[PDB]
Amino acid sequence: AKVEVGDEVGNFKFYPDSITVSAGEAVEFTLVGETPHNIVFDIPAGAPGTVASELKAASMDENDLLSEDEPSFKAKVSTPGTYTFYCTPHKSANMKGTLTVK
Template sequence: MRSLLSPSIATLALLSVGAKAEAQRVHEIQMEANPQKEVFRFVPSQVTARPGDVLLFKAISGAPHSIVFEAGSLSGPAHEALNGAMSRRAGDLSSPLLNPNGAEYRITVPALAPGRYEYFCLPHRAYDMRGTLQIAK
């Protein structure tokens, strides 16, 4: 009986670890700026994610960059959840500056209601450098 129980427990443990690993996805978002070509963008500009996924922002060119979520359209719980998910915040809903090129910033998507969450790069806001986080149903 004991030998039958051990493989079953081991199998369940492996299945639960595998399920957890598949649930989290890393979405790389590149941050680019080239004033000579008038290019200021997040690539991709829209990311569809689920709570638990990771947003990996990478400063590729034109640093410094930042990620600031638009506060005006957020509910109180969404505002708190996003602030809580942003380590080393520079301010409300704002990442620290990513400088130099090559710098990275990670946000683990918190429990947010399905919908669109807009963000922008503060140093390049005048150039309309913005992106959208779409939370899937």
């Protein structure tokens, strides 16, 4: 799957903000526009350790941004379920999305 992170106009949005993948299918998040963004998965209170580890590995560090230099990031989630992700700098600006893994 592919997700666009941001746009050329400066909106704090993922495009699309909902995607469905098959287990093992990578999601490639690629920056669009000049505004830096990142992507980090929410880890539910509740999630088993294996799922928490998957989600951490599928997340950028909060000290990391996509740029024209490093334009993309690839996330792989094996556990079927629905997951929410967000952008660290624009988290409060409601820059978020969902991933369903079949």
